[PDB]
Amino acid sequence: HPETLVKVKDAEDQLGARVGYIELDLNSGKILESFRPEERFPMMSTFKVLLCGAVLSRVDAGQEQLGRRIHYSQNDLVEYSPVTEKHLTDGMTVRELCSAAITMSDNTAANLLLTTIGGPKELTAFLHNMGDHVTRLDRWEPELNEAIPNDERDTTTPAAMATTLRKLLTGELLTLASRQQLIDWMEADKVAGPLLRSALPAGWFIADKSGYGERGSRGIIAALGPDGKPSRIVVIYTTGSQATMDERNRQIAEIGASLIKHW
Numbered sequence: 001h002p003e004t005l006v007k008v009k010d011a012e013d014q015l016g017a018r019v020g021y022i023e024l025d026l027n028s029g030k031i032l033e034s035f036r037p038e039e040r041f042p043m044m045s046t047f048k049v050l051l052c053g054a055v056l057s058r059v060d061a062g063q064e065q066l067g068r069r070i071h072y073s074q075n076d077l078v079e080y081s082p083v084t085e086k087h088l089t090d091g092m093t094v095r096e097l098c099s100a101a102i103t104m105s106d107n108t109a110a111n112l113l114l115t116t117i118g119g120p121k122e123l124t125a126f127l128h129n130m131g132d133h134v135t136r137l138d139r140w141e142p143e144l145n146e147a148i149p150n151d152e153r154d155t156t157t158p159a160a161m162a163t164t165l166r167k168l169l170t171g172e173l174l175t176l177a178s179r180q181q182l183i184d185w186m187e188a189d190k191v192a193g194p195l196l197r198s199a200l201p202a203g204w205f206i207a208d209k210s211g212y213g214e215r216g217s218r219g220i221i222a223a224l225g226p227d228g229k230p231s232r233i234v235v236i237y238t239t240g241s242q243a244t245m246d247e248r249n250r251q252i253a254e255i256g257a258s259l260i261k262h263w
C-alpha cells in the first residue's frame, strides 16, 4: 500500500537515517512492497536466525545433534549473555544455545554456535550455497555490531535477507522437523516486545528476531499473519540515526501498524 510506504518515508524524515523495508508473500515469494531493497544494512543480532539455520542444516546431515552438550568457561562470556552466564557449571546443549541465541539474543551462545560451524566465513559459505551471494558475516560478537558507515562487513540487504529467510522457513533446504524448530524459536522471541509485536492484533501469529547496533542501528525480521498462521515476511532495518532506542522502536511500530491495517 502507498500509505505503508508513506510511513517508511516519514520514518526516514523523523529519524534522519536510511530505512530498508521488504514485504514478502510467504506462499509465492513475490515482493508485495519494497523500499531501498538492494541497499546494505547491518544485520546485528538478526543474523542469529541465519546462524541457527546453518546449525540445523548440520543436524539434518548428521554432522550435529541437538542434544550435544557444550562446556565453556567465563572466558567465552561476552557482553549481553543472559542465559550462558548461568550455565558455566553444567554447560548447554546445542538446542538450548540456539534457543538462547534467538529467544533471548544471547551473545555468548551465538559465538559458541559460530565455533561449531567453523566461524563467520563458514556461515557466509552456508548462505552462499543456498543462493545468497549478498549477505555476509565477517566478525564475532560483539564486534559485528559496529555498523561503520559504508562498511560492507556483517551486512545484508532487505531483499536478500527476506528471500533467504523464506528459503530457511519454508524452502527445501531444511527438513520439516528442522523447519519447525527454527519457527518455534522465533515465535518464542522475548526481546522484541515494543516492535512489531506491539501493534499485533489478538490471534495473529508472529515469529521474529530483532536487533540493534551502534550509530542508531535497529532492525527486525518477522514471519507473521492473521489467525495464528504466518503468511508474509517483513524485513525492516535502519541505521545512521542519532535517535534514542525508544524513538527507533516507535517508527518500526508505526510501520507495523500500517502494514497490519492494510494487510
Ligand SMILES: *C(=O)N1C[C@H](NOS(=O)(=O)O)CC[C@H]1C(N)=O
Pocket (backbone or CB within 6 Å): 044, 045, 046, 080, 104, 105, 107, 142, 145, 191, 192, 209, 210, 211, 212, 213
Ligand atoms: C542484537 O542486535 N543484539 C543482541 C542484544 N539485543 O538483541 S535485541 O536488540 O534484538 O533484543 C543486545 C543488543 C544487540 C547487540 N549489541 O549485540
